[PDB]
């Protein structure tokens, strides 16, 4: 788990896809919550330690230094460059708006909802 490399990473609006040195294909519904359905080579993936290790590598890739940017990128399905926050709504560099997900305080996970009309 700990010393193989991630060789390809891409993000869409439904999941983060990854390809490892070992040839496996991760399909990860990030951030990790009880609602997530992860797949390893089109098979169900139920190692929460592995999913959290890849999610931590992807927090460091997308959020750069700020994990909040990575969480906004997961919610938006695209790698954002920056964001500003005001009154609880987060606006990224492309103008996309987000608010905190309703499950955030209950899952104790940083998750966001794409608030288009807020």
**Side-chain-facing half-sphere of 62: CA atoms under 13 Å:** 28
State how far the Cα of 2 lies from the Cα of 103, in Å rounded to an integer: 29
1-22 core/surface letters (b: 16 or more CB in 10 A; e: else): eeeeebeebebeeebbebeeee
**Side-chain-facing half-sphere of 49: CA atoms under 13 Å:** 2
State how far the Cα of 50 lies from the Cα of 8, in Å rounded to an integer: 16
Experimental approach was X-ray
State how far the Cα of 86 lies from the Cα of 79, in Å rounded to an integer: 21
All structural domains of the chain with their residue ranges: 6-113
State how far the Cα of 25 lies from the Cα of 42, in Å rounded to an integer: 8
DSSP notation for 27-88: EE-SSP-TT--EEETTEEE--HHHHHHHHHHHHHHHSTT-HHHHHHHHHHTS--S-EEEETT
Residue 84's CB: how many other CB atoms inside 10 A?
Answer: 9
């Amino acid at each position: 788990a700990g010393s193989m490399k991630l060789l390809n990473i891409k993000i869409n609006e439904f999941a983060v896809t990854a390809n490892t040195e070992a040839g496996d294909e991760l399909y990860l519904q990030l951030p990790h919550t009880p609602d997530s359905q992860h797949s390893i080579n089109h098979e169900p993936l139920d190692d929460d330690d592995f999913v959290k290790e890849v999610q931590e590598i992807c927090d460091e890739y997308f959020g750069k230094g700020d994990r909040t940017l990575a969480r906004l990128s997961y919610a938006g399905g695209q790698a954002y460059d920056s964001y500003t926050e005001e009154d609880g709504v987060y606006t990224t560099n492309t103008g996309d708006q987000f608010v905190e997900h309703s499950y955030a305080d209950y899952y104790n996970v940083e998750v966001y909802c794409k608030a288009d009309l807020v």
